[PDB]
Amino acid sequence: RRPVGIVHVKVVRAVGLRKKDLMGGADPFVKIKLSEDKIPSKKTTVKHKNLNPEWNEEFKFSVRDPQTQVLEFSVYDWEQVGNPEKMGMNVLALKEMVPDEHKAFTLELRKTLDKYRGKLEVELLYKPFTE
Ligand SMILES: [Cl-]
Ligand code: NI
Ligand code: NI
């Protein structure tokens, strides 16, 4: 249960998101969760009225097993009233990480784990601990 290293997750952008709101397209933010972890999920900022949001927002997670653990990204639409509705999601195993390399991925958004839902572009940088 002791952390092997730290993975730096950059949420870069989404491209081609579906229209969801009656006007303005969507107000997207991303939730990021790491499997086999009790840390509450992280989220990006809300981008208002943008189907091609650009975030470049960075998050850090403690890694306890690079072989087993997977990240889950979920794109939600913000509204002031009501619960955010999920627009799409996908998963990304940490066994695709590379130590000390920025590695970029394009995840197609899907309904669950069909209509096209856009792409999410992210980066991972794995910094393992030494000695
Ligand atoms: Cl926000
Ligand atoms: Ni970094
Ligand atoms: Ni660098």
Author numbering: 256 to 368, 378 to 395
Quote the study's own text.
Unexpectedly, we were able to solve the structure of SYT1C2A with one cadmium ion (Cd2+) at site II using different crystallization conditions. This structure mimics that with one Ca2+ at the high-affinity binding site. Indeed, the analysis of oxygen, Ca2+, and Cd2+ complexes found in the Cambridge Structural Database of chemical structures determined at high resolution reveals that the coordination numbers and geometries of Ca2+ and Cd2+ with oxygens are very similar. Interestingly, the comparative analysis of the structures of SYT1C2A in complex with Ca2+ and Cd2+ shows that Glu 334 at L3 changes its conformation to replace a water molecule at site II, whereas the positively charged side chain of Lys 275 replaces the Ca I. In this conformation, SYT1C2A might be unable to bind membranes through this site as Ca II would be occluded to interact with the phosphate moiety of phospholipids. Thus, these data might provide the structural basis for Ca2+-mediated activation of SYT1C2A to bind membranes. The metal binding site of SYT1C2A restricts the metal–metal distance to 3.7 Å. Hence, it is likely that the constraints imposed at SYT1C2Asite hinders the presence of two Cd atoms site hinders the presence of two Cd atoms.
Synaptotagmins (SYTs) are the plant orthologous of E-Syts and regulate the ER–PM communication in response to abiotic stress. In vivo studies showed that SYT1 is anchored to the ER through an N-terminal hydrophobic region and binds to the PM through the two C2 domains at the C-terminal end. Similar to other C2 domains, SYT1C2A folds as a four-stranded β sandwich with a Ca2+-binding site placed in a cavity formed by three loops connecting the two sheets (L1, L2, and L3). We have shown that the domain displays a dual activity to bind PS or PIPs in a Ca2+-dependent or independent manner, respectively.
